[PDB]
Structure formats: structure tokens, C-alpha cells
Amino acid sequence: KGYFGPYGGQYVPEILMGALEELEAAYEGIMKDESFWKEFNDLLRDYAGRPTPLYFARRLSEKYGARVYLKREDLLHTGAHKINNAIGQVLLAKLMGKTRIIAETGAGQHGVATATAAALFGMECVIYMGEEDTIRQKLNVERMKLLGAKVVPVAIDEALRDWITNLQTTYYVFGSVVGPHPYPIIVRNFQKVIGEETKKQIPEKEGRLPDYIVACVSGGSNAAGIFYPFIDSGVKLIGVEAGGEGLETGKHAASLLKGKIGYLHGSKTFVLQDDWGQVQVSHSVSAGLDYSGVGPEHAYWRETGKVLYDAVTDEEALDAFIELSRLEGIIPALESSHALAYLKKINIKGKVVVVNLSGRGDKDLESVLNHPYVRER
Amino acid sequence: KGYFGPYGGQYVPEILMGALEELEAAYEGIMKDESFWKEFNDLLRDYAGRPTPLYFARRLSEKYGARVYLKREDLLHTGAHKINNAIGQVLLAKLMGKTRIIAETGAGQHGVATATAAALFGMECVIYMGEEDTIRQKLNVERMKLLGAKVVPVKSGSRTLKDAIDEALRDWITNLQTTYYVFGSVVGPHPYPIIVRNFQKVIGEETKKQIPEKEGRLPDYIVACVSGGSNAAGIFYPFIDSGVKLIGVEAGGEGLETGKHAASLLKGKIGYLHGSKTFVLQDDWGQVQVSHSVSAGLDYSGVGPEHAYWRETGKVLYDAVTDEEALDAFIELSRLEGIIPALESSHALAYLKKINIKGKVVVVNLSGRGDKDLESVLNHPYVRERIRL
Numbered sequence: 233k234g235y236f237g238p239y240g241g242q243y244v245p246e247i248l249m250g251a252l253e254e255l256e257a258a259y260e261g262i263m264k265d266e267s268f269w270k271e272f273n274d275l276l277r278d279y280a281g282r283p284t285p286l287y288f289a290r291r292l293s294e295k296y297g298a299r300v301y302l303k304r305e306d307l308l309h310t311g312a313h314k315i316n317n318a319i320g321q322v323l324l325a326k327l328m329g330k331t332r333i334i335a336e337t338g339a340g341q342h343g344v345a346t347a348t349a350a351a352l353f354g355m356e357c358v359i360y361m362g363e364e365d366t367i368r369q370k371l372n373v374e375r376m377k378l379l380g381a382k383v384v385p386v387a388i389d390e391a392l393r394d395w396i397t398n399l400q401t402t403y404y405v406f407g408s409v410v411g412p413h414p415y416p417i418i419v420r421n422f423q424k425v426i427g428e429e430t431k432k433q434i435p436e437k438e439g440r441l442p443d444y445i446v447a448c449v450s451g452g453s454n455a456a457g458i459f460y461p462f463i464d465s466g467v468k469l470i471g472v473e474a475g476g477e478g479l480e481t482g483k484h485a486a487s488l489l490k491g492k493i494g495y496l497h498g499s500k501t502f503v504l505q506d507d508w509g510q511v512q513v514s515h516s517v518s519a520g521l522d523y524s525g526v527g528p529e530h531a532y533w534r535e536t537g538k539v540l541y542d543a544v545t546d547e548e549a550l551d552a553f554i555e556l557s558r559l560e561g562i563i564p565a566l567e568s569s570h571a572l573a574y575l576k577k578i579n580i581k582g583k584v585v586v587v588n589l590s591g592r593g594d595k596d597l598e599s600v601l602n603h604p605y606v607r608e609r
Numbered sequence: 610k611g612y613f614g615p616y617g618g619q620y621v622p623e624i625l626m627g628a629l630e631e632l633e634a635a636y637e638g639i640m641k642d643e644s645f646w647k648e649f650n651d652l653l654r655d656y657a658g659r660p661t662p663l664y665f666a667r668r669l670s671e672k673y674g675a676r677v678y679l680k681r682e683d684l685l686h687t688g689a690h691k692i693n694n695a696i697g698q699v700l701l702a703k704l705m706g707k708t709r710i711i712a713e714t715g716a717g718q719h720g721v722a723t724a725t726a727a728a729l730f731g732m733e734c735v736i737y738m739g740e741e742d743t744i745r746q747k748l749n750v751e752r753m754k755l756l757g758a759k760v761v762p763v764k765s766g767s768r769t770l771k772d773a774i775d776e777a778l779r780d781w782i783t784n785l786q787t788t789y790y791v792f793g794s795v796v797g798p799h800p801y802p803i804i805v806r807n808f809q810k811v812i813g814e815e816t817k818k819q820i821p822e823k824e825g826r827l828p829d830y831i832v833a834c835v836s837g838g839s840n841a842a843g844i845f846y847p848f849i850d851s852g853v854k855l856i857g858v859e860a861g862g863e864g865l866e867t868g869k870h871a872a873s874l875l876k877g878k879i880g881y882l883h884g885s886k887t888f889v890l891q892d893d894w895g896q897v898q899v900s901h902s903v904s905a906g907l908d909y910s911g912v913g914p915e916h917a918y919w920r921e922t923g924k925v926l927y928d929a930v931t932d933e934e935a936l937d938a939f940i941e942l943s944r945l946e947g948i949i950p951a952l953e954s955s956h957a958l959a960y961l962k963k964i965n966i967k968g969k970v971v972v973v974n975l976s977g978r979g980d981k982d983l984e985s986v987l988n989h990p991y992v993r994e995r996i997r998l
């Protein structure tokens with residue numbers, strides 16, 4: 233229970249177990265509540281904009297001699313897949329009687345999605361963010377403030393302390409399939425709607441299950457959402473981690489490829505550590521992939537071989553960012569640009585490939601243009 | 610032909626009539642071209658994201674004691690209804706054999722939507738934008754250049770939407786052989802008003818089928834913002850003479866009696882602007898005046914001739930809201946529904962306070978999202994004073 237094979241668990245201090253048991257019990261009581269999931273799927277349709285299209289990128293398919301299809305999660309409300317999980321967890325907080333929503337964010341994407349869902353349900357919202365990340369991401373900070381959320385500059389530790397201090401009224405929204413049980417299973421079950429839509433959409437366009445399904449992986453929420461309905465179906469599922477400046481450079485975030493077994497934020501999983509078990513700081517041109525750990529379900533999928541994993545560098549992601557913008561007129565998130573950049577490293581000639589476009593790249597345009605590799609290009 | 614009652618026509622230099630007649634014939638030819646409307650509707654579904662949902666705004670409905678539904682055009686690719694028209698016209702332009710696309714833009718939405726359609730169809734693109742708008746919309750300018758389009762800031766006149774159209778029209782006449790002009794609203798000479806409206810009426814057609822599934826009858830009100838009027842004509846057209854009260858909201862600026870607004874229908878006079886006989890903000894000597902609005906998308910001295918016809922016959926009711934009222938509705942929807950609306954659409958949302966809707970079914974056309982307006986809203990003196998509590 234709470235383990236994907238040997239990975240996962242609840243490796244947390246004892247002061248946090250009271251909240252986890254309450255959440256684990258409330259979530260189990262809605263696993264077979266059709267009124268909950270119907271209300272969840274109605275908001276996904278009318279509020280988030282689901283189902284998302286499965287768009288055939290003709291100009292991109294002709295470039296690689298393949299049939300590249302893009303699952304357009306960039307068209308959701310707020311512009312990223314994060315709204316799927318944020319809506320579900322705040323709905324869960326509504327059933328639990330919570331009146332206050334809190335979360336942490338580094339880039340600001342999950343912070344905006346959380347403040348959005350909190351305003352939809354009419355709850356108080358407090359977003360915790362590093363004081364350095366606030367000064368840089370002033371636009372997303374003002375987005376959250378416009379949505380009615382209080383932004384507290386300082387991270388996860390301060391937010392978790394808030395959760396325990398005000399457990400009577402406060403719910404904590406985890407942004408990815410990380411952390412202690414039951415958060416990894418909760419987020420994956422709120423994100424699998426991606427793969428379930430793709431499973432019903434790809435036969436209406438090809439009459440055949442896809443050959444490849446590619447997605448970027450940091451924490452792993454968008455990949456697990458599109459991979460889970462395709463586990464053990466013959467489709468080659470490929471997760472792409474953040475290679476940073478290079479896997480052999482120590483400036484990356486490929487937790488599955490270069491990490492070791494460890495405990496991060498309550499989860500037994502692969503964590504970037506040194507030889508002495510000290511967690512190392514990750515690095516990536518995409519702030520959405522700047523995480524030292526990875527979801528335990530992705531560690532279990534790699535061990536059992538049900539999903540393959542590789543990585544692409546920062547420069548290669550910046551190329552796929554410019555490529556999709558000029559060839560298809562879609563400005564992709566720098567996160568999803570890693571999954572698009574992997575179209576070059578595999579032979580897809582005559583194959584049907586589905587890429588999970590996890591978000592739009594409007595928020596990354598300033599960072600891409602100011603990058604020294606793009607400036608010199 | 611080409612007129613909506615007395616309004617419309619082709620009041621253009623004679624050298625433009627050859628291009629207008631060619632476009633009119635090319636458009637009338639694709640009327641039954643099932644492959645064109647299939648590829649257009651297929652791109653609307655898979656590339657733009659249609660159909661857009663009809664969202665019930667529970668907290669907004671509770672505040673006004675009504676049943677308020679939002680047509681979520683903010684969820685489309687590029688984030689505004691402008692993508693509907695940009696895809697249809699650039700597709701038409703590609704099939705006509707053109708190789709160059711130009712367009713005007715105010716806030717940058719039509720400029721992005723055109724460059725987006727130009728990149729999708731692999732066509733050279735040049736966007737004309739008022740210099741005062743380029744400095745305040747640096748994000749959209751860089752979006753356009755990333756899509757492969759050239760952005761030219763117009764430095765003449767008031768350096769806004771109207772002057773951008775002026776310079777863009779001078780480009781079109783100079784390069785009639787290769788260049789297609791994508792008009793961004795239901796304005797300009799025939800057949801542009803009818804073309805843009807027919808590409809946008811999918812909004813109203815989806816709404817007509819969605820509202821009975823949620824309420825079992827037609828709504829009492831449909832509200833949309835009107836400057837040029839393309840998003841309003843798209844949602845109004847299928848409901849003309851249906852009994853639903855259709856309300857178009859113009860930009861009142863600082864006030865309809867301050868000389869700083871863009872309410873062409875309410876304060877303008879009959880005139881000629883960019884090839885169309887319609888209502889135009891003019892002085893006593895018949896010279897077009899400079900418009901003003903907190904929203905760059907509504908900053909236009911003219912209005913579509915179809916709206917002038919609808920106002921004259923009373924098929925649509927027209928009114929205005931001020932900059933401050935639109936700013937309030939912008940903040941209101943953000944906090945009540947978690948939706949940051951375009952400042953253009955915020956004029957329609959502001960009109961919920963002006964109608965007696967206690968117990969009514971109201972559909973608001975949410976024509977776009979307000980990410981582009983964040984800085985303009987927060988830096989506005991009225992909002993800054995509100996922030997000061």
C-alpha cells in the first residue's frame with residue numbers, strides 16, 4: 233500500500249502522518265463515488281476545456297517521414313496540464329470540508345493552476361514561493377494575486393508547516409506525482425484523463441494503436457497521465473528527462489538516469505545525490521523540470537521496463553521550441569520541448585508517434601530569446 | 610450587393626476594385642467547396658480547439674442572482690476568437706495562389722493569430738502595429754517574430770489601430786500582385802465584412818446548440834463587446850430575430866461625453882472609413898477623430914456595417930461601459946471564476962451590472978483571455994488607487 237513495487241511510501245516525520253491518514257481515508261471514500269468523478273469530469277469539460285484535440289502536425293510529420301500527432305494539453309485553461317490535477321484536488325478539498333487551499337511553486341505554473349482552482353471553488357488560497365523566484369517571475373506572481381491568492385515569499389517546508397498548523401481548514405495541493413502516499417496516486421488518477429482521451433482518439437485517426445508515445449518527465453505528472461492507460465499495450469512509451477547542459481556535466485535534472493536511491497519529500501525514489509547521500513541541486517533551462525527527484529511510479533515503470541527513459545539537453549530543447557513555433561505555429565512549453573526534441577533521436581520513419589504537448593510556451597518566450605545559445609543562433 | 614441596408618459597400622481607390630472582385634469571386638466559389646469547409650472545420654477542431662465550452666459561472670451567477678454562461682473563446686489557440694477568422698482567410702489566400710500575408714493589429718491578438726496561420730500554411734507574413742501598442746505589448750510582438758513574421762511599428766498619426774490599417778493599406782496597394790490582406794474584423798470593403806462574419810458565426814452556432822442542453826430554452830440575453838464587431842457578429846448572427854435580447858457593448862473610454870472613447874455607433878456619424886460606409890467618430894467637419902480606450906483591441910474609430918444595420922433596425926441593442934467599469938469586471942471575473950478575461954470582453958462582463966437579470970439566463974461572449982492586459986490593468990491609475998484600498 234502506497235508503494236509502486238519497491239518505490240514510494242510515506243517516509244515523513246510523525247508530525248505529518250495525521251494529515252496523510254486523513255487525506256488517504258477521504259480519497260478512498262470517493263474512489264467509487266460516481267457523483268465525485270462526474271462533477272470532476274464536468275468541470276474538466278466546461279471549465280478546463282476537455283477533451284483536448286489530437287492534432288496531426290502535417291508539416292512536422294513530413295519533416296521526419298512519420299505521422300506525428302500532438303496531444304494538445306496547451307489548449308487547456310491556464311495553458312498547461314496542471315489544471316487537471318488542481319481542479320480535482322480542490323474538489324477533493326471541498327468534499328473534505330476544507331475552506332483554505334495552499335501549495336508551493338517554483339516556476340509559477342502550478343501556483344497559477346492552484347490559485348485558479350481555489351477561485352473557482354471560492355476558497356482562500358496561499359501560494360508559497362522562494363523569494364528569489366518571486367522577484368524573477370513577477371508576471372506569474374501578479375497572476376496569482378489577481379486570482380485572489382496570497383503569495384508568501386521565503387518553500388515546501390514552510391508550506392507543509394502551514395498545512396499541519398491549520399489542518400482544520402487547509403488542504404495542500406501537490407503539483408506532481410511526487411511526495412508521500414497518497415499524493416502520487418491522487419495526481420496520476422487526476423491526470424490519466426489525458427491517456428484515456430488519447431486512447432479513444434488515436435483509433436479515429438489511424439485505426440491502430442500508436443507506435444510511440446513521447447512525453448517529458450521531471451516529477452512526471454503529465455507523462456504518467458498519458459502513459460498509464462497504455463501500460464502493457466505494446467506501445468513504446470518514452471519519458472524524456474531534462475539533460476541540462478549535458479548528462480556528464482552535473483548540471484541537469486535526470487533523476488532516473490543519473491540519480492540514486494533515496495528519500496525526497498516523503499517518497500522513496502531516485503534522487504540526484506552525491507557519493508555521501510546528500511541531495512544535489514538540479515539545473516535546467518526549463519524551470520518546470522528543475523526538480524532533483526522523480527515520481528515513484530516512474531521508477532517502478534523503468535525497473536519493470538514498461539516505460540523507456542532518455543534525456544535531451546537544453547540546446548536541443550531550445551531547438552524544438554523554435555522548430556514547432558516556425559513549422560506549426562504552436563509555441564510549446566520549454567518542458568514539452570524536451571519531448572519534441574526527442575523526435576530526432578529515434579527512427580520514426582513510417583511510424584505513428586504521439587507527443588504530449590503538456591503546455592504552451594508563452595511563459596518561456598523571454599527566457600528563450602535571452603538565452604546565449606539562442607542569441608548566437 | 611455588399612450592403613447591409615444602407616451600410617457597407619466598396620468605397621475604395623479604383624485600383625483596389627480588381628482585387629476586391631477577385632476575392633469576392635474566389636470566396637463565392639468556395640461556398641459549396643466541401644473540402645474547404647471540411648479542412649476549415651477540421652483545423653478549427655484540432656488546431657484551434659473548437660468547439661469551445663459554454664461554461665456556467667456559478668459564483669458570478671450567485672452574485673447577480675442570475676444564470677450567467679460564458680462562451681469560452683479564451684480557450685482557443687493564441688487565446689482569442691481572432692484565430693477563427695485568421696485560419697479561414699489565410700487558407701483562402703493560400704488557395705488563391707498568393708504568397709504574402711499582411712495584417713493590422715491593435716493589442717496584437719490578430720497579429721499573432723495571422724502570423725500563426727501564416728506559419729501553419731508557410732506564407733511570408735508582415736504585421737503592422739501602432740508604435741504606442743508595440744511598446745505596451747512587447748510579449749505579443751515577440752510571439753509574432755518567433756512565428757516568423759515581420760512587425761513594423763507605425764509611427765504616423767496616433768500610432769494605434771487606425772493608423773496601422775492606414776500603413777497596411779498602403780502596403781497592400783503597392784504589392785497587389787503577391788499580397789493578401791487579412792482583415793481582422795467585420796470592417797473594410799465588401800466582401801471583408803461578410804467573409805469575417807461567416808468565419809466567426811461558428812461561435813453563435815455552437816452556442817445555439819449548447820444553451821438548450823443546459824437550460825432547455827433560448828437565453829434571455831446575449832452580451833458581447835463591439836468595436837469592429839467580429840466576435841459579436843459571430844455570436845449574434847444565428848440569433849437574429851429569435852426573441853433573444855442581443856446587446857453589443859462599445860468602449861466608453863473615460864466617458865461618452867469626454868471626447869475620449871471609441872463608441873462609434875453611439876457617438877459617431879455616417880461616414881466612410883477604410884472602404885466601408887458606416888458609423889465613424891468624426892468632428893463637425895467630417896474628419897475622423899482619434900479614438901481612446903483602456904483596451905487596445907477596442908481602440909478603433911469605426912464599426913462594422915452589419916452592426917450599423919442591426920442598430921438601425923433594432924435587431925441588436927447597443928450601449929457602452931467606461932474604462933473603469935471594464936477594469937472592475939476584469940478584476941471581478943478573475944477573483945470569482947479564476948478566469949482572467951481580455952479587457953475587450955471585460956466590457957461585456959461589466960454590462961451585467963446594467964441589465965435587470967435577477968432570474969434571467971445570460972450568455973456572455975468571452976472573446977479572449979487577458980494575459981496581454983495584465984500590465985495595463987495593474988498600472989492603470991484607477992486600479993492602483995483601488996489596490997491602495
Ligand SMILES: Cc1ncc(COP(=O)(O)O)c(C=O)c1O
Binds near residue numbers: 454
Ligand atoms: C507545461 C509543463 N509541462 C510539464 C511540467 C513538469 O510537470 P510534471 O513533470 O510533473 O508533469 C511543467 C512544470 O511543472 C510544465 O509547466
Ligand SMILES: Cc1ncc(COP(=O)(O)O)c(C=O)c1O
Binds near residue numbers: 839905
Ligand atoms: C480578445 C479580443 N476580444 C475582442 C476583440 C474585439 O475585436 P472585434 O470587435 O473584431 O470582435 C479583440 C480585439 O480587437 C480581442 O483581441
Ligand SMILES: [K+]
Binds near residue numbers: 450
Ligand atoms: K527530476
Ligand SMILES: [K+]
Binds near residue numbers: 836
Ligand atoms: K469603434
